C-alpha cells in the first residue's frame, strides 16, 4: 500500500501539507475550506491503511485515491466546467488531464493583506489554519512550485510570525521577513517551472544534461559515476514533482539529502554545516551551497575528446554516457561558465561526432572542435557587457522601459500584461548581474534570462498569439535567448488605432504601491508603443513623462475625479499629434 508507505515515511504533518498542495495545485479555483475538508478525509483514510494495509481501498494508486477525492468537488461544471472532463476520465488519462489543465496565470484575486496585529491575532487564535492557508495560497497560484521546498518556506513563514508578533514593534519585524520570503518564493517558482518545462517538452535527457553540468560545477572533485548517480536521482525527483506525484517527490528528495550527507567526503568538501541542519532546511541548504575547489592540476579536454584515437568507439557504445562525460569534464573545469552555453557547446560536439564518424577519416574534422566554441562563447559575452553600460546609465526602472519598448516592438502580438511582467523581470538582470565583475557577469545574466524567458514561453503557450514566440520556445530549449535575440522588429503587424481608457488614469491609482504604480505607468507605455511600432524615437519618454507626471498633478489635486475626467483628455491629443 503506497498511501501507507508514504504516510509513515513523511509523517502526518508533511503528508497533510503535501496533500493540500496536491489538491490546491489541481483544482485551483476551489475554496480553501473545501480542500481542507478533502485533505482530512484522505488523512482519515491513510491512518486506517497504516493500521490495516489489507483494508478495502489501500491498494489503489495515489493518483486514483487523490483523483476520486478531488473529483468530488470538481464534478460541478456550473462552478468549474473544464476539469469535470478529467473526472469522467480514468487513470492514467485523468492525471494527464489535471496536469494539462494546470494554469500558470490564474484569474484570481490578491489577498489584500490585513494589518500586522490582526495577522498576529489570527496566528494565535488558530495558527494551524493560518499556516494551512499559506500553503494553499502559494500552491493555487504556483501549480508547479517545488512542493517539498514550499514546506521549507512555510516553516520559515511560521517562524517569522512567532518572532515578530512577540516583538515590541510587530510591523518593522514582520514586513521585511515576509517580503524576503515572497521574493525568495518567486525566484523558486520560476526556477522550478524551467525544470518542469525541460522535463515535459524536451525529455529527461535534456534535464539530465542540465543537472550533470550543474552538479559537476558544484561538485568537481566527485567522480563522473558519482555525478550520474546524483543526476539520475534528482531526475526521478523532479519528474515526480513535475508529474504531480508530490508525496514520493518529498520522500525521494529526502532520500537523496540523506545519501549526499552520508558520502559528504566523496562528493564535496563544502557540505559540513549543510548536512547538520534539520529535515527541511537540509535540502534547501545543500541545493544552494557554494562551488567546491578544483582538484589540483587537471589534464586537457582534448586528449580524451580529440587527440585520442577511439572517440567513435566510445561514442558508438553509448553516446549519452560519453556526452555525459564531456558535460562532466568540461563543466568541472569551468564554474565561470553558464549552463545554457555549455549545453550549446556539448551539442556542437554531438553533431560534429555524427559528421566526422560518418566520414572515411574521423580525426581531421573533429580536431577543429575547440575553435567552433569561440564564437558560441563570445556571443553571450558581448550581449551582457553591452546591456550593462546601457543599464547603469538608466537605472532598473528606466532600463525596464528600454526593454518594454524593444520587446513590445519585437513581438507586438503578445498580451500587454505578459509583456509588462516579462520585461520587468528581464531587466531585473541588470540589478543582480551587472553588480558583479565580468568573472561572474555574462554567466549570471545568460542563466537568469533562461528562467525569465521560460516564464514568457509558458505564459504564451496558454493562449498563443504570435508565430515567432511559439518558435523560439519550441525549437530548442537552450537556443532560446539567442533566438529572441535574433528577432528583428516586425513589419507584419496591423496596429490597433486608439484606445482612450488605456491612457486615462483614476483616483484609485493614488492609493496603491509604487510598484503597482510603476506597473500601471508601464502598461500604458506598452499600449502606446502598440499604437506606433515604426518611426518612434525617445519621444515615447515625453508622452510617458506626461501620463506619469500628470498623475502628480491630480493626486495632489484635492478633488472628486474632476481633473481625471478632463486633464487626462488634454493628454490624448498630446499623444497622437506628438
Ligand atoms: O541533445 C539533446 O538536446 C539531448 C541532451 C542534451 C542537451 C543539451 C546538451 C547536450 C545534450 C545531449 C543529451 N543528453 C546527454 O547526452 C546526457 C547527459 C547525461 C548526464 C548524465 F549524468 C548521464 C547521462 C547523460 N546523457
Ligand atoms: O535540482 C535540485 O533541486 C538541486 C540541485 C543540486 C543539488 C545539490 C547540489 C547542487 C545542485 C544544483 C541543483 N540543480 C539546479 O540548479 C538545476 C537547475 C536547473 C535548471 C534546469 F532548467 C534544468 C535542471 C536544473 N537543475
From Swiss-Prot:
Annotated consequence of substituting residue 371 to N: In Nagasaki-2
GO MF annotations in UniProt: antioxidant activity; copper ion binding; DNA binding; enterobactin binding; exogenous protein binding; fatty acid binding; identical protein binding; protein-folding chaperone binding
Annotated site residue numbers, Not glycated: 16, 37, 60, 69, 89, 102, 132, 155, 170, 177, 186, 191, 201, 208, 236, 258, 270, 282, 355, 368, 385, 398, 410, 428, 432, 462, 471, 496, 515, 520, 534, 537, 553, 556, 560, 570
Effect in UniProt of substituting residue 110 to G: In Yanomama-2
Domain Albumin stretches: 1-182, 183-375, 376-573
Effect of residue 532 to E: In Castel di Sangro
Phenotype for residue 368 to E: In Naskapi/Mersin/Komagome-1
Gene Ontology CC terms: blood microparticle; cytoplasm; endoplasmic reticulum; endoplasmic reticulum lumen; extracellular exosome; extracellular region; extracellular space; Golgi apparatus
Function: Binds water, Ca(2+), Na(+), K(+), fatty acids, hormones, bilirubin and drugs. Its main function is the regulation of the colloidal osmotic pressure of blood. Major zinc transporter in plasma, typically binds about 80% of all plasma zinc. Major calcium and magnesium transporter in plasma, binds approximately 45% of circulating calcium and magnesium in plasma. Potentially has more than two calcium-binding sites and might additionally bind calcium in a non-specific manner.
Protein name according to UniProt: Albumin
Naturally occurring in which organism (per UniProt): Homo sapiens (Human)
Gene: ALB
Amino acid at each position: 500500500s503506497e498511501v501507507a508507505h508514504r504516510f509513515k515515511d513523511l509523517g502526518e504533518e508533511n503528508f497533510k501539507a503535501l496533500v493540500l498542495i496536491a489538491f490546491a495545485q489541481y483544482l485551483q479555483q476551489c475554496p480553501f475550506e473545501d480542500h481542507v475538508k478533502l485533505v482530512n478525509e484522505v488523512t482519515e483514510f491513510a491512518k486506517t491503511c497504516v493500521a490495516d494495509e489489507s483494508a478495502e481501498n489501500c491498494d489503489k494508486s495515489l493518483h486514483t485515491l487523490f483523483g476520486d477525492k478531488l473529483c468530488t468537488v470538481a464534478t460541478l461544471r456550473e462552478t468549474y466546467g473544464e476539469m469535470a472532463d478529467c473526472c469522467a476520465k480514468q487513470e492514467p488519462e485523468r492525471n494527464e488531464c489535471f496536469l494539462q489543465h494546470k494554469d500558470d496565470n490564474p484569474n484570481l484575486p490578491r489577498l489584500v493583506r490585513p494589518e500586522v496585529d490582526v495577522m498576529c491575532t489570527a496566528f494565535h487564535d488558530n495558527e494551524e489554519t493560518f499556516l494551512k492557508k499559506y500553503l494553499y495560497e502559494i500552491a493555487r497560484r504556483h501549480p508547479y512550485f517545488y512542493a517539498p521546498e514550499l514546506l521549507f518556506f512555510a516553516k520559515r513563514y511560521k517562524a517569522a510570525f512567532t518572532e515578530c508578533c512577540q516583538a515590541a514593534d510587530k510591523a518593522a519585524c514582520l514586513l521585511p521577513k515576509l517580503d524576503e520570503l515572497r521574493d525568495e518564493g518567486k525566484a523558486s517558482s520560476a526556477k522550478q517551472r524551467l525544470k518542469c518545462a525541460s522535463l515535459q517538452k524536451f525529455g529527461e535527457r535534456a534535464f539530465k544534461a542540465w543537472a550533470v553540468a550543474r552538479l559537476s560545477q558544484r561538485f568537481p572533485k566527485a567522480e563522473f559515476a558519482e555525478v550520474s548517480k546524483l543526476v539520475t536521482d534528482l531526475t526521478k525527483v523532479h519528474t515526480e514533482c513535475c508529474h504531480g506525484d508530490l508525496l514520493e517527490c518529498a520522500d525521494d528528495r529526502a532520500d537523496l539529502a540523506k545519501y549526499i550527507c552520508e558520502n559528504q567526503d566523496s562528493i564535496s568538501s563544502k557540505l559540513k554545516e549543510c548536512c547538520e541542519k534539520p529535515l527541511l532546511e537540509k535540502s534547501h541548504c545543500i541545493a544552494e551551497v557554494e562551488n567546491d575547489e578544483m582538484p589540483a592540476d587537471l589534464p586537457s579536454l582534448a586528449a580524451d575528446f580529440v587527440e585520442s584515437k577511439d572517440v567513435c568507439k566510445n561514442y558508438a557504445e553509448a553516446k549519452d554516457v560519453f556526452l555525459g562525460m564531456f558535460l562532466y569534464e568540461y563543466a568541472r573545469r569551468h564554474p565561470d561558465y553558464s549552463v545554457v552555453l555549455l549545453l550549446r557547446l556539448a551539442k556542437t560536439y554531438e553533431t560534429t561526432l555524427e559528421k566526422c564518424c560518418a566520414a572515411a577519416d574521423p580525426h581531421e574534422c573533429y580536431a577543429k572542435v575547440f575553435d567552433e566554441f569561440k564564437p558560441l562563447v563570445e556571443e553571450p559575452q558581448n550581449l551582457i557587457k553591452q546591456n550593462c553600460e546601457l543599464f547603469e546609465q538608466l537605472g532598473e526602472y528606466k532600463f525596464q522601459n528600454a526593454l518594454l519598448v524593444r520587446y513590445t516592438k519585437k513581438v507586438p502580438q503578445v498580451s500587454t500584461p505578459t509583456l509588462v511582467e516579462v520585461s520587468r523581470n528581464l531587466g531585473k538582470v541588470g540589478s543582480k548581474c551587472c553588480k558583479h565583475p565580468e568573472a561572474k557577469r555574462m554567466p549570471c545574466a545568460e542563466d537568469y534570462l533562461s528562467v525569465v524567458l521560460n516564464q514568457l514561453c509558458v505564459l504564451h503557450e496558454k493562449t498563443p498569439v504570435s508565430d515567432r514566440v511559439t518558435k523560439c520556445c519550441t525549437e530548442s530549449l537552450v537556443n532560446r535567448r539567442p533566438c529572441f535575440s535574433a528577432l528583428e522588429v516586425d513589419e507584419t503587424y496591423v496596429p490597433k488605432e486608439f484606445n482612450a481608457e488605456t491612457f486615462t488614469f483614476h483616483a484609485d491609482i493614488c492609493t496603491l504601491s509604487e510598484k503597482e504604480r510603476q506597473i500601471k505607468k508601464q502598461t500604458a507605455l506598452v499600449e502606446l508603443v502598440k499604437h506606433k511600432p515604426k518611426a518612434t524615437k525617445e519621444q515615447l519618454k515625453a508622452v510617458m513623462d506626461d501620463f506619469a507626471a500628470f498623475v502628480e498633478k491630480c493626486c495632489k489635486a484635492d478633488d472628486k475625479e474632476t481633473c481625471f475626467a478632463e486633464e487626462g483628455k488634454k493628454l490624448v491629443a498630446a499623444s497622437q499629434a506628438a
